[PDB]
Design an enzyme around this catalytic site. Sequence first.
Site, PDB file in Angstrom:
ATOM      1  N   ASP A  35       0.624  -1.293   0.068  1.00 52.00           N
ATOM      2  CA  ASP A  35      -0.066  -0.041   0.080  1.00 52.00           C
ATOM      3  C   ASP A  35       0.685   1.431   0.075  1.00 52.00           C
ATOM      4  O   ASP A  35       1.086   1.669   1.211  1.00 52.00           O
ATOM      5  CB  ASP A  35      -0.902   0.025   1.140  1.00 52.00           C
ATOM      6  CG  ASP A  35      -1.836   1.153   1.536  1.00 52.00           C
ATOM      7  OD1 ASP A  35      -2.169   1.913   0.397  1.00 52.00           O
ATOM      8  OD2 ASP A  35      -2.450   1.320   2.478  1.00 52.00           O
ATOM      9  N   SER A 199      -0.966  15.971 -11.752  1.00 52.80           N
ATOM     10  CA  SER A 199      -1.332  15.556 -12.963  1.00 52.80           C
ATOM     11  C   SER A 199      -1.386  16.672 -14.071  1.00 52.80           C
ATOM     12  O   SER A 199      -1.897  17.725 -13.619  1.00 52.80           O
ATOM     13  CB  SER A 199      -2.525  14.419 -13.202  1.00 52.80           C
ATOM     14  OG  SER A 199      -2.868  14.241 -14.683  1.00 52.80           O
TER      15      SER A 199
END
Length: 330
Positions: A35, A199
């Site tokens: 994770d 992004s």
Amino acid sequence: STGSATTTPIDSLDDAYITPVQIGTPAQTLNLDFDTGSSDLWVFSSETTASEVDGQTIYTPSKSTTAKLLSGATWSISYGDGSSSSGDVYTDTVSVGGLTVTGQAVESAKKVSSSFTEDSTIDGLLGLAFSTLNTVSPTQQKTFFDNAKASLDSPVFTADLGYHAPGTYNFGFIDTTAYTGSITYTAVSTKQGFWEWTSTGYAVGSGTFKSTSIDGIADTGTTLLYLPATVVSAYWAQVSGAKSSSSVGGYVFPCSATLPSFTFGVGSARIVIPGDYIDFGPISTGSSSCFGGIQSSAGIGINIFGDVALKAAFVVFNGATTPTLGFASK
């Protein structure tokens, strides 16, 4: 030194990926969920409440000649999905794909919430976010990656997740045969303890790319791609019959639909998520409504580049002094 381990989806939908990890002496192999959105290595153990264990393999520190109680240390963690776990801490030898860390903090579960108990194939989590998010008290502990870092050939790990197929987690090296083209690197903020990046935009199917900044985390431990409501509505508007359902808890679409792809930007580079990766199958068995792989981040407080996005790429988690994230097509 380096490590290389195969990661396998736990089911037909890629709901989570499990990677075998060796703990203790003689080795006890547990299948952990790697994770990058948490920093605790915790396992189901001989101390976990018997009614909260249903099919999991447990860590028994009393059978390990290298286990030592980390005297007085406790841990308690809550995850975004509402699940939680807590217990005490041991130190023991931990190996992932041939890479060994001695004296790693192994957080033994005393209690796990129902969500953990019902996932019989997940024996625990191996946190790969920054050690500042670790919940061990009063002495905060380091992740397996942090502890291994000085011994690694390169201070990196890579996630190459498969779509309905196994993949690989590599430590200390970049496999130049696992991707096509070049790897585009992008800045990371460690201020919230996550692999947090920006992004450069998105496209829906064959539509034009929209240049817009989207802050978010690269999170292997989250199944889906969670983005701002504006972006998610623009995607689902291209799928006839798709709607957001409050009864289901998100966007659903007719199981008869062929989904368009979703492209996200990494600098001047593009990563294309095929439409099939966004289909999470029927909401309930036999249902004609299918669950969407792209959901709104509105109720979370953070955008999450989960497995839906990461599995479309070869992803580098660069843990050098100035951390960066690398993305390549594959």
